[PDB]
Swiss-Prot record, chain B:
Belongs to the DSR anti-defense 1 family. The lineage of its organism: Viruses, Duplodnaviria, Heunggongvirae, Uroviricota, Caudoviricetes. GO terms for biological process: symbiont-mediated suppression of host innate immune response. This is DSR anti-defense 1. Counteracts the defense-associated sirtuin 2 (DSR2) defense system of the host. Inhibits the NADase activity of host DSR2 by competing with the tail tube protein that normally activates DSR2. The record marks 54 as: Interaction with host DSR2. Changing residue 54 to E: Complete loss of the ability to inactivate the host DSR2 NADase activity. Interacts with Bacillus subtilis DSR2 (via C-terminus) in a 2:4 ratio; this interaction leads to the absence of activation of the NADase defense activity of DSR2. It comes from Bacillus phage SPbeta.
Length: 670, 115, 657
């Protein structure tokens, strides 16, 4: 506590009653002649200290400060995910115990935990004799941590793994799980530091915290500063010297991260570090949003209108990918305008994403598969591809990513619907070129071929299936014909009913002869068949004969409705066929006029057919919660109904304070 | 009215639906019988569609634990509902809530917000 | 078998195992290892060498049987008549061999000894410690006592062969045995002091050995009943006779015979070594709760020291019982990480039924009454499965929380009668406008708390006086720099003489080491007070609030309305536990800025969620009779919490939203 060392890289005095050795050292560094004054051995020591301080980034005194810069740089194959280089390093022959230390870390990061445990034990055997107290201590800590991770993994797999995996997996044998339990009996990490030689306890006290149950409590409690509200109205920047809390928090995070990864410490993988990273990043982004909003209010909208209080880069991208889950990313997005936040260093991000793609391909194309490695490689891969929507990619990289996403990402962690969502997010910032269209076409062909077998059936968690890939292809290429799917149709036969349906869902992609042959395999004979075809089968136009079915059904229902008035009884209803017909007429799909006679049975039908004479006291506002964008736009356009809808929406938003009604009001009707 | 099975009920206002963990037995068109069914609703306001599609939400019906596909007009008449606690207050509660709410499929098992 | 061994243990054996395990837990245990453990692994016994010497000395081989003196005499004669290099030649020939360790060494190390003392010269225990990863300082010569690298020793009293196979490094003849006290003063002193200040367990010796009896003669002349009787682990083929048992127990020993514990053959030495070494000791590291009175006694031993405090946070209880259970903010206990007898379930069962309580013995009903009163005042109700209608209430009795300044003036004026009153008075002065009068009173209490006590008021006085010193120093920084403008005058609240003295006294104080300097009993009785010296006391509550905030806000964005209990009742319950604990225990942490930021963020979330649920009585209720009723409204405690911890900007932020 003789001095304060600040994240900025400037040092200051603190409760020092004596000589200014640090100020003198900086003065000697400044002037060469003063250094020439020192002796020779002291000159060598000065050189060593100069290298050390420059490497750690200590610059000069605070008063002698200036426009100091700052840039993060981590030298670690593990931080950057160089799995192949790491494996090549493991395969070589060691030359030191420090090489063994780094190699055992690399083994831990690739999921090979028994090798890591054994190598740490061997290092412990050698290092006590080799008088490397630092490596001995750190190896003890890291081996205890690996033992803990193995122990929790075994419980997790034997408790729930057999279900999600579909088969009971045994990463570790019984002999190993017995031997380690025998070796690590009554072992306590709490007395490890106190049992070391006192010269070690004097030189390396700064490592004591590595043996505690929890660290990073002051770091977390210091996050309360980003939540202050008075600062925007009046802020002093009291943090350090003219530095806002944002910079201090971010540089503290970078220091923690670099220290843990560069020293090869296995605490980077535990729940506490991940939580700390999540909390820090979320609060920072939220604060930037708040500042932007308050600035826009106080000054003109032109002032910071789309200004980004948060600028993202490569390290932020990898941090969020490695430490966030999908729910956490969904919260940071609905909270703030991430689309307003701009990403930088996009070439390195592209490199990182292509690395992820190639590792996915290697992992799942090959028959061999590591279990713990897959489970610690599946979350980050999913997060990276989800957060790849805000970056701009080149065509070849986009193709590699899309192929890996569509063909090699396991169905157990990404089904058909989530695959579609992930894929469709990537077209928001990169307009679909022909190459990816071809890849999607290949995927559709393969999935069609899967359907020859009867038992096969697609399974999705959100109701999205191949139909949606088909529609997406045609969205960007209006004129598109699949020749492989066309010849699939032309070889088609009646008994291939499942293929009949599958290719019915994909009608627009087929050719003229293909679709003619296919439609030769189905026909409509009744209104139920008509609705089934419109839903599935894509009946585009209401044939003259099709409208006659509608009127016949409507007249039958008119007779039944007269008999119902006679009854005065109505048990229950499930789906309204009348309201759909009313909407179809209102959208100008049915051109007949007879159904106007069949009026006065259902409120919604009348509302959609004859808006002008509609008794608007019977309007039910919740109807508006079922319509989609096109129908709401049409309703806004029509004149007989615009102001009544305005009134009901305005009465609801006033009383209930509901946000869906407010958004409907403000997006279309005004 | 008061029961221990109403502590899991949630109301979703964007689509005016109830989410509850219940299972239903359904007689359809007074001729078909099915047991242990439920529904899943998806909210999706920007879907690539045509003039036939004018709804924001899509419903999936599950029979037993297997996806169900019905082409016949889906007339629906509840006959029995069951909760994990298995109480029978749910059978009466379901009819009341269904009568109160006008939207189709008032009570479902899950809601998926796609935007 | 092992179940049978644990079952056949008499009362004495059970008590001995209890004491051994407790001392091992406390970090004060030591093993005195003989030669049987080193013969379990094959290693040339001394008698073998005694044969060779004889064969060399007299042409004939060994005859008849050898007496005790012959062992120490024949090597002596051989040394005298032949020379020194023949003695060393035989020593090197017989002893220069490598042998493997055995399970007994691993078990001994697994016991976690503080030191180790041995009469063997082989390096088997060295390799054992080197494989287990333990670090010990080896002492086998006089020069090693002064220059020791660590604070824990592996002490070879009779020597070793780490400097050659000469006969001068070891003690193996009669001359060496006679001149021991004159050639090994320091090693003997060290062994004697370690024996005096530690718990000692003998293994692999066998009664009647020269060393055990030599030390029993020291304990008779060099003691006044001011020592703890050593233990003994006897492993002989046949059970010890009663007469020898009484004779040796009266002579300062506590015997534990493995032959009685289990049955085995004559030559199954490893079996009986293991049956008592650790198969019984480590396995019995767990408790022994099996009766309706031991439950009360154990829970009392754990909860009695906390009667010095006024209140305990429920979360903190998770540390008192060492993660055996979970204690919830709503008052329910849930089992977690406990594999033994369920004593909390038993305690609540006894609470419910009166007859079970009547079964309790005398002098044990009052301890139950005390524990029942404690758990009732602190708000612990029952186990989670038997939960009833849990209620929520608030009651803080602090005169300082309610802002009653005149009553605190009167209280300070009045005379005190105990140090508890002075503790409260020092809290008050600080809550009134006096940092100089409270500092002096804290130092005075620190002075007068020398008398026998728990050490609780002393530790808390030290923490509070350091905090008051910090508060004084920061004011001066804003008094002679900013205060010159705030009032327009150089306000000198404290003199230069006072600010000089307080700085000189608080120049060496490090709050980081305050708890580590405390007697070890206090550290094992009040480990929840350790977090009151850093930012670790508000870590679990801030991690919880940061999470419930992201959860409540995602639901308000989706538009969902549940019909159960609020998801932020935990935010309210934790906040009021922190307030009662800090104000009723008179702690100056109630003035910190990070505690003010915690209360502001907790109260803001509750009011925002209350506004969201007030307008929903039109959306759900308006579409269908069905709805909800539960809510949140302001009361005395909420008004005073906002008034003391919010700034006008913070209140305006919530008034616009």
């Amino acid at each position: 506590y003789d001095y304060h060392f600040e994240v900025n890289g400037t040092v200051v005095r603190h409760k020092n009653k004596g000589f200014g050795y640090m100020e003198r050292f900086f003065e000697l560094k400044e002037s060469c002649d003063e250094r020439s004054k020192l002796s020779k051995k002291q000159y060598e020591r000065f050189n060593a200290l100069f290298n050390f301080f420059e490497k750690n980034g200590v610059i000069c005194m605070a008063k002698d400060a200036g426009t100091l810069n700052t840039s993060i740089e981590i030298n670690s194959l593990a931080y950057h995910g160089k799995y192949d280089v790491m494996k090549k390093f493991i395969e070589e022959q060691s030359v030191s115990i420090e090489d063994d230390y780094k190699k055992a870390f690399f083994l831990a990061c690739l999921g090979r935990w028994e090798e890591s445990y054994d190598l740490y034990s061997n290092i412990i055997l050698n290092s006590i004799d080799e008088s490397n107290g630092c490596v001995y201590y750190l190896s003890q800590i890291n081996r205890y941590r690996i033992y803990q991770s193995i122990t929790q993994a075994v419980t997790q797999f034997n408790g729930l793994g057999l279900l999600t995996f579909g088969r009971h997996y045994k990463p570790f044998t019984d002999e190993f799980l017995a031997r380690i339990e025998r070796e690590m009996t009554n072992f306590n990490i709490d007395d490890l530091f106190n049992g070391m030689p006192f010269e070690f306890q004097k030189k390396y006290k700064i490592l004591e915290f590595l043996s505690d149950n929890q660290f990073l409590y002051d770091d977390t409690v210091k996050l309360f500063e980003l939540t202050n509200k008075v600062r925007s109205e009046m802020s002093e920047g009291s943090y350090s010297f003219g530095m806002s809390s944002d910079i201090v928090v971010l540089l503290r995070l970078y220091d923690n991260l670099r220290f843990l990864y560069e020293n090869c410490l296995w605490s980077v993988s535990f729940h506490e570090f991940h939580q700390y990273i999540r909390n820090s990043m979320s609060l920072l982004i939220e604060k930037a949003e708040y500042e932007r909003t308050r600035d826009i209010d106080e000054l003109g909208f032109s002032f910071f209108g789309k200004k980004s209080g948060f600028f993202m880069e490569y390290y932020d991208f990898v941090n969020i990918s490695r430490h966030f889950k999908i729910d956490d990313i969904k919260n940071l997005e609905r909270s703030c305008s991430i689309d307003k936040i701009r990403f930088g260093e996009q070439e390195k991000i592209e490199e990182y994403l292509v690395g992820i793609a190639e590792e996915i391909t290697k992992q799942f194309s090959a028959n061999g598969m590591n279990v713990v490695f897959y489970t610690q490689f599946i979350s980050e891969a999913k997060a990276a591809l989800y957060f790849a929507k805000y970056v701009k990619l080149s065509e070849e990289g986009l193709g590699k990513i899309v192929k890996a996403l569509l063909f090699y990402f396991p169905e157990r962690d990404l089904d058909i619907g989530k695959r579609y969502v992930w894929l469709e997010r990537l077209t928001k910032c990169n307009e679909l070129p022909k190459s990816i269209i071809s890849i999607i076409d290949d995927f559709l062909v393969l999935q069609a071929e899967k359907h020859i077998d009867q038992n096969y059936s697609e399974v999705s968690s959100n109701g999205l299936y191949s139909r949606d890939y088909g529609a997406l292809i045609k969205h960007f290429e209006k004129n598109f014909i699949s020749k492989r799917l066309s010849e699939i149709t032309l070889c088609l036969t009646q008994d291939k009913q499942k293929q009949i349906d599958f290719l019915f869902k994909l009608l627009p992609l087929l050719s003229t002869n293909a679709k003619s042959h296919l439609l030769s395999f189905k026909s409509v004979e009744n209104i139920n068949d008509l609705m089934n075809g419109i839903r599935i089968g894509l009946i585009d136009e209401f044939t003259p004969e099709h409208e006659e079915l509608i009127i016949e059904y409507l007249e039958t229902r008119k007779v039944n409705y007269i008999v119902e008035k006679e009854k005065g009884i109505q048990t229950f209803s499930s789906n309204d066929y009348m309201s759909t017909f009313g909407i179809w007429y209102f959208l100008e799909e049915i051109n007949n006029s007879k159904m106007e006679e069949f009026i006065g049975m259902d409120d919604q039908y009348d509302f959609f057919v004859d808006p002008e004479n509609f008794d608007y006291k019977k309007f039910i506002p919740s109807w508006l919660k079922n319509y989609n964008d096109k129908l709401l736009g049409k309703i806004a356009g029509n004149k007989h109904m615009k102001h009544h809808v305005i009134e009901v929406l305005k009465e609801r938003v006033k009383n209930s304070n509901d946000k869906r009604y407010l958004e409907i009001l403000m997006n279309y009707f005004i | 009215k008061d029961t221990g099975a109403t502590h899991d009920l949630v109301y979703h206002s964007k689509i005016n639906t109830f989410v509850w963990d219940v299972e239903f037995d359904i007689v359809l068109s007074d001729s078909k019988e099915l047991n242990k069914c439920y529904f899943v609703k998806c909210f999706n306001p920007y879907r690539i569609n045509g003039k036939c599609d004018f709804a924001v939400s899509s419903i999936d019906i599950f029979s037993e634990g297997k996806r169900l596909l019905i082409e016949n007009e889906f007339n629906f008449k509840i006959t029995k509902a069951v909760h994990v606690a298995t109480s029978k207050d749910v059978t009466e509660i379901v009819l009341h809530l269904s009568e109160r709410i006008s939207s189709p499929f008032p009570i479902v098992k899950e809601v998926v917000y796609l935007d | 078998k092992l179940k049978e061994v644990f079952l056949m243990l008499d009362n004495n054996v059970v008590e001995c195992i209890k004491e051994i395990t407790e001392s091992s837990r406390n970090g004060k245990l030591v093993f005195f290892v003989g030669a049987g453990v080193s013969t379990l692994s094959d290693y040339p016994q001394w008698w073998r060498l005694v044969d060779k010497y004889h064969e060399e000395l007299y042409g004939s081989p060994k005859k008849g049987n050898y007496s005790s003196d012959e062992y120490l005499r024949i090597p002596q004669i051989f040394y005298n008549v032949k020379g020194e290099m023949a003695f060393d030649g035989i020593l090197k020939d017989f002893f220069q061999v490598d042998k493997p360790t055995n399970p007994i060494h691993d078990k001994i190390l697994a016991m976690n000894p503080a030191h180790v003392i041995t009469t063997n010269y082989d390096n088997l225990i060295d390799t054992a410690c080197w494989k287990r990863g333990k670090y010990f300082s080896v002492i086998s010569a006089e020069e090693d006592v002064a220059n020791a690298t660590s604070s824990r020793y592996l002490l070879k009293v009779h020597g070793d062969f780490r400097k050659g196979f000469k006969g001068e490094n070891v003690v193996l003849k009669e001359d060496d045995y006679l001149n021991y006290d004159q050639n090994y003063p320091l090693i003997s002193n060290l062994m004697k002091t370690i024996i005096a200040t530690h718990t000692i367990v003998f293994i692999g010796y066998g009664l009647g050995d020269y060393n055990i009896n030599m030390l029993l003669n020291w304990v008779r002349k060099l003691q006044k009943d001011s020592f703890h009787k050593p233990f003994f682990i006897r492993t002989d083929p046949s059970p010890i006779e009663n007469e020898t048992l009484i004779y040796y127990e009266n002579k300062g020993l506590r015997i534990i015979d493995a032959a009685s514990l289990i049955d085995s053959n004559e030559y199954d030495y490893l079996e009986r070594y293991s049956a008592v070494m650790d198969l019984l000791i480590e396995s019995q590291e767990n408790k022994f709760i099996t009766k309706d009175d031991e439950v009360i006694d154990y829970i009392y031993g754990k909860i009695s020291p906390l009667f010095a405090l006024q209140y305990i946070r429920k979360i903190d209880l998770k540390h008192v019982f060492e993660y055996d259970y979970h204690f919830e903010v709503n008052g329910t206990v849930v089992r977690h990480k406990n594999k033994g007898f369920g004593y909390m379930e038993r305690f609540f069962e006894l609470k419910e039924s009166c007859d079970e309580r009547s079964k309790l013995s005398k002098k044990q009903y009052e301890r139950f009454n005390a524990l029942f009163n404690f758990f009732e005042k602190n708000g612990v109700i029952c186990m989670a499965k038997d939960a009833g209608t849990l209620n929520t209430s608030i009651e803080i009795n602090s005169l300082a929380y309610h802002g009653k300044y005149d009553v605190m003036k009167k209280f300070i004026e009045e005379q005190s009668v105990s140090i508890e009153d002075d503790y409260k008075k020092a809290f008050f002065l600080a809550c009134l406008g006096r940092w100089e009068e409270s500092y002096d009173l804290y130092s005075n209490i620190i002075l007068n708390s020398i008398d026998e006590s728990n050490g609780c008021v002393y530790y808390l006085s030290q923490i509070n006086r350091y905090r008051i010193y910090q508060s004084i120093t920061q004011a001066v920084t804003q008094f002679n720099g900013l205060g010159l403008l705030t009032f327009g005058r150089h306000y000198k609240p404290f003199t230069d003489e006072f600010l000089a003295r307080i700085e000189r006294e608080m120049t060496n104080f490090n709050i980081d080491d305050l708890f580590n300097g405390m007697p070890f009993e206090f550290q094992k009785k009040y480990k929840i007070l350790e977090f009151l010296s850093d930012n670790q006391f508000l870590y679990d509550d801030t991690v919880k609030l940061f999470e419930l905030t992201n959860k409540v806000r995602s639901e308000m964005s989706e538009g969902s309305y549940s019909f159960g209990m609020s998801s932020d009742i935990v935010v309210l319950l934790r906040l009021y536990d922190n307030l009662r604990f800090l104000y009723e225990n008179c702690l100056w942490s109630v003035s910190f800025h990070e505690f003010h930021q915690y209360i502001r963020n907790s109260m803001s979330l509750l009011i925002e969620k209350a506004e969201y649920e007030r307008t929903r009585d039109i959306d759900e209720l308006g579409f269908s009779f069905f709805g909800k009723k539960s809510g949140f409204f302001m009361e005395y405690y909420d008004f005073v919490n906002i008034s003391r911890h919010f700034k006008i900007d913070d209140i305006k932020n919530l008034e616009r939203s």
